[PDB]
């Protein structure tokens, strides 16, 4: 499913991401934009052979099982295909583990390179939250 920006803001909010570990909602939306373009079905292979899945491009190297990433972990205890559903619950609770991992939203390369240091609030401007 391709979310609209405010549509995703609202789902991310009801699931507890707004100010989760101190990251305001606009951070999560900016991350989602530049990782997946708000598309739940988004998949991208990494050079190391792992694949990123979902709204937040969660990787099979550490966080989910995709049957094909050697010597990988599944720290979220889920199939990676679950991260592609139009229901973002699995992607959101897995993101809570990742962001709690010590490196915060720096885990997300797009966040670090395109969101961090910017006016992220703009990404929820005009949304009814």
UniProtKB/Swiss-Prot annotation:
EC number: 3.2.1.17
Location in the cell: Secreted
Active site (record annotation): 35, 52
Gene3D superfamilies, per the entry: 1.10.530.10
Alphabetic keyword roster: Allergen, Antimicrobial, Bacteriolytic enzyme, Disulfide bond, Glycosidase, Hydrolase, Secreted, Signal
Catalyzed reactions per annotation: Hydrolysis of (1->4)-beta-linkages between N-acetylmuramic acid and N-acetyl-D-glucosamine residues in a peptidoglycan and between N-acetyl-D-glucosamine residues in chitodextrins
UniProt KW Hydrolase keyword: yes
Entries under InterPro entries matching the protein: Glyco_hydro_22 (IPR001916), Glyco_hydro_22_CS (IPR019799), Glyco_hydro_22_lys (IPR000974), Lysozyme-like_dom_sf (IPR023346)
Binding site residues for substrate: 101
Cystine connections: 6-127, 30-115, 64-80, 76-94
Keyword Hydrolase attributed: yes
GO biological process, one term: defense response to bacterium
Any GO MF annotation of the entry: identical protein binding
One term under GO cellular component: extracellular space
Pfam families xref list: Lys
Tissue-level expression: In the egg white and polymorphonuclear leukocytes.
C-type lysozyme domain location: 1-129
Self-association state and partner proteins as the record states: Monomer.
Additional remark text: Lysozyme C is capable of both hydrolysis and transglycosylation; it also shows a slight esterase activity. It acts rapidly on both peptide-substituted and unsubstituted peptidoglycan, and slowly on chitin oligosaccharides.
Function statement: Lysozymes have primarily a bacteriolytic function; those in tissues and body fluids are associated with the monocyte-macrophage system and enhance the activity of immunoagents. Has bacteriolytic activity against M.luteus.
Family: Belongs to the glycosyl hydrolase 22 family.
Protein name per its UniProtKB record: Lysozyme C
Gene of this entry: LYZ
